[PDB]
Design a protein around this motif. Structure first.
Motif: not given
Length: 248
Positions: A78-85, A94-106
């Motif tokens: 989550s911290r790694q993703i946050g750093r890329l937003v 927070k909204l964009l982190v969730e989007v990035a997380k969904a991309v990574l998860t897929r």
């Protein structure tokens, strides 16, 4: 409008098109499956204004499926993703982190689980693009069901807005496949009802096993996978509403 089921896209060198002409449930479900796979694959290329996508997809998630799932829900990732937003506002970030997380998860899970629907992606032009200008076009009319999700693409079109539309089209596809394939999604929800907010390795192991024991056809298993992932707070479909709220 009269009966129609079509998807075309034209932007830079991405030019594809597909429609249904023989309106069976099988053909409709396969069309929507291919649309979902196609638009989902293209979303990350439209997130670059706000998310360092190259960095995101370079995140290393090692191990078995169970280990990957534990990594995806971890504070470290989550911290790694946050750093890329690229956002300073706490609420919007927070909204964009969730989007990035969904991309990574897929991307991390698509070869481990039935994340993509059957049929792969739309790579050619079965029909020519509906518009001469750059555009995205999803048009559906069948029975009482009508969806029109389209726009022209200009040099002044925000990339994130294209991402939003693509995510919205994906949501339509995911919502409607279970109708055309008669997926009992209620039964699937109840199947996983013994799990909530799954965090521990032991429980991840248990829920993956329960997913593997789920008896269902090619379409039903995509929803079982999504339901299993939801118990961990994971998504494989980008939430369009997050991008909508950012753009407001």
């Amino acid at each position: 409008i009269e009966r129609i089921l079509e998807f075309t896209a034209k932007h830079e060198e991405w030019i594809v098109g597909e429609n249904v002409e023989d309106f069976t449930n099988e053909n409709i479900a396969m069309f929507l499956s291919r649309v979902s796979n196609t638009v989902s694959s293209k979303i990350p290329g439209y997130l670059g204004e706000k998310i360092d996508v190259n960095g995101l997809l370079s995140i290393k998630i090692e191990g078995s499926l169970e280990e990957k799932l534990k990594a995806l829900i971890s504070p470290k990732v989550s911290r790694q993703i946050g750093r890329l937003v690229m956002e300073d506002d706490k609420k919007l970030k927070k909204l964009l982190v969730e989007v990035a997380k969904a991309v990574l998860t897929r991307e991390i899970l698509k070869n481990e689980l039935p994340i993509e629907f059957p049929g792969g992606k739309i790579e050619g032009l079965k029909i020519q693009p509906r518009y001469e200008e750059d555009h995205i076009n999803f048009t559906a009319r069948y029975g009482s069901w009508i969806v029109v999700k389209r726009m022209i693409i200009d040099e002044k079109t925000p990339l994130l807005d294209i991402a939003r539309l693509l995510a919205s089209i994906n949501e339509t596809a995911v919502n409607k496949i279970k109708d055309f394939a008669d997926v009992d999604d209620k039964k699937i929800v109840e199947y996983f009802g013994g799990f909530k907010k799954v965090k521990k390795e032991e429980e991840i192991k248990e829920i993956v096993q329960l997913f593997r024991e789920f008896k269902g056809n090619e379409f039903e298993v995509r929803y079982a996978a999504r339901e299993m992932l939801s118990k961990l707070g994971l998504k494989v479909d980008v939430p369009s509403k997050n991008l909508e709220k950012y753009l407001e």
